[PDB]
Amino acid sequence: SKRALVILAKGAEEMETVIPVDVMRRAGIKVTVAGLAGKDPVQCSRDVVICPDASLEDAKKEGPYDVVVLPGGNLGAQNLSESAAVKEILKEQENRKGLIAAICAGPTALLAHEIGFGSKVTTHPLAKDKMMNGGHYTYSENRVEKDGLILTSRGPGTSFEFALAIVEALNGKEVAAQVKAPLVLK
Amino acid sequence: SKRALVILAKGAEEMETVIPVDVMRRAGIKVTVAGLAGKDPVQCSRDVVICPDASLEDAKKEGPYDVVVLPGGNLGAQNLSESAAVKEILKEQENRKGLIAAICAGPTALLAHEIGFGSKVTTHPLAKDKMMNGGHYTYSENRVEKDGLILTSRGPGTSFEFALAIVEALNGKEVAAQVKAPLVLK
């Protein structure tokens, strides 16, 4: 009965959006895919078009959520970083001691909104310098990094690991293992 | 300048749809996401809603394609299996000696349409018995199986491998390696 908010902006990495949504739903998490710009379909980085479940404005009224998830994609992460609405959502989640999960370029939105300073984080290798501007975080090359309530990961190829880490954090290791087996992961 | 047709039906596994589309586009392949039922948005197995690029009817007029891709998801694969339009597309592709790629439950649509009999194939473990009804194929537990122009794979967790195998088949090993590195695969 845990709840996840996935914030979907134009230019989001569609694999990094869909893998966590799908895996979290397999884990019995109630996931809301919320469109940053509104209710309209979102054109992702490789032109996959995804229809959000709700606008972010409407989804926020239905919170709070057990996790807020930020997909990557450079242009998607920049749109998340420039959003006052995302700022408020992340600050409130941080304030209530709720989990925040971000992947690839996604964690650079944490920097933009001054979230989780002092945490160990990872990002896509190409996003490291952006994330580390100012030295506000300590960098990690782990495929998934979790420092308390800040959970980060590196890229499309770590999305399953990222998603299962979220499942483990919310629903426990046993559920994560049960969800993992039918995926045919290596 | 290679071209891929991805046939998207209600109940398709969204990870198995999006990963190949995204990875193939990273490889410079022109991908058409074609809606089986028409141009309308498609509700995937875990409720991700994807807007196709075109209807299958319209996409067929723009062929032929260097690969026809069948995602899995049990209900999606069943819809592919029951479609006369898919039958014609697969038979024509087989007739012109073009590549057909299917993942998870996806290969059971090959059985339904009598495509590639005598090939070595793999499927999701839970789809093995369906696929092997009649003994028309030889079963494999390889994560990706390629027997000439029939390329198969096992599940969401083999989707990157499946996608990169398609890229290698169309654009060569060097391009596949170049596309792979920024994904941060294990």
From A38, A39, A33, A1, select the one nearest A18 (Cα to Cα): A33
Q: Inter-chain contact A48–B21, Cβ cutoff 8 Å?
A: yes
**Omega into A64 within 30° of 0, i.e. cis?**
yes
Rounded CA separation B167/A39 (Å): 34
Contacts of B33 in chain A (CB under 8 A): 48
Helix, coil or strand: residue B50:
strand
**B51 catalytic, yes or no?**
no
Count Cβ atoms below 10 Å from residue A148 Cβ, excluding itself: 11
Residue B69 CA: distances (Å) to CA of A82, B89, B90, B107, B135: 37, 11, 10, 10, 23
Contacts of B160 in chain A (CB under 8 A): 156-157
> Residue B47 has what DSSP assignment?
S
Rounded CA separation A18/A54 (Å): 16
User: Chain B contact for A96, CB < 8 A?
Assistant: no
Residue B18: its H or E element: helix B14-26
Count Cβ atoms below 10 Å from residue A16 Cβ, excluding itself: 35
Provide the annotated active-site residues of A.
Answer: 104, 124
Give the strand pairing for A42-43 and A49-51.
antiparallel
> Residue B182 has what DSSP assignment?
G
Strands of the sheet containing A54-55, edge to edge, are: A54-55, A30-35, A3-8, A67-70, A99-103, A150-153, A144-147
Beta-carbon contacts of A178 under 8 Å, excluding residues fewer than 6 positions away, are none
Contacts of A26 in chain B (CB under 8 A): 46
Rounded CA separation A87/A72 (Å): 16
Rounded CA separation B172/A184 (Å): 26
The C-alpha of B125 sits at a distance from chain A's nearest C-alpha, in angstroms, of: 9
User: Chain B contact for A60, CB < 8 A?
Assistant: no
Contact criterion met (CB below 8 Å) for A88 and A115: no
The position carrying tokens 């499946």 is B162
The position carrying tokens 């190409």 is A126
The C-alpha of A156 sits at a distance from chain B's nearest C-alpha, in angstroms, of: 5
The C-alpha of B31 sits at a distance from chain A's nearest C-alpha, in angstroms, of: 10
**B44 catalytic, yes or no?**
no
The residue extents of the domains of chain B are 1-186
Phi, psi (degrees; rounded to nearest 5) at B59: -65, -35
Q: Give me the residue from B21, B41, B124 closest to A46, CB to CB.
A: B21
- Left (φ > 0), alpha (ψ -120 to 50) or beta: where does B110 sit? alpha
Beta-carbon contacts of B155 under 8 Å, excluding residues fewer than 6 positions away, are A182, A183, A184, B16, B72, B103, B104, B124
The secondary structure of A114-181 as a DSSP string is T-STT-EE---GGGHHHHTTTS-SEE---SEEEETTEEEE-SGGGHHHHHHHHHHHHH-HHHHHHHHG
Structural tokens at position B43: 């509700």
Q: Inter-chain contact B50–A46, Cβ cutoff 8 Å?
A: no
User: Chain B contact for A54, CB < 8 A?
Assistant: no
Task: Report the length, in residues, of chain A.
Answer: 186
Rounded CA separation B106/B13 (Å): 10
Q: Give me the residue from A13, A124, A157 closest to B185, CB to CB.
A: A157
Residue B126 CA: distances (Å) to CA of A18, B65, B153: 23, 30, 13
Helix, coil or strand: residue A84:
helix
User: Chain A contact for B34, CB < 8 A?
Assistant: no
Rounded CA separation B163/B24 (Å): 7
Rounded CA separation B136/B139 (Å): 10
CATH class of A1-186: alpha beta
Cβ contacts below 8 Å, chain A against chain B, sum to 95
Structural tokens at position B55: 């209807």
Phi, psi (degrees; rounded to nearest 5) at A16: -75, -15
Residue A43: its H or E element: strand A42-43
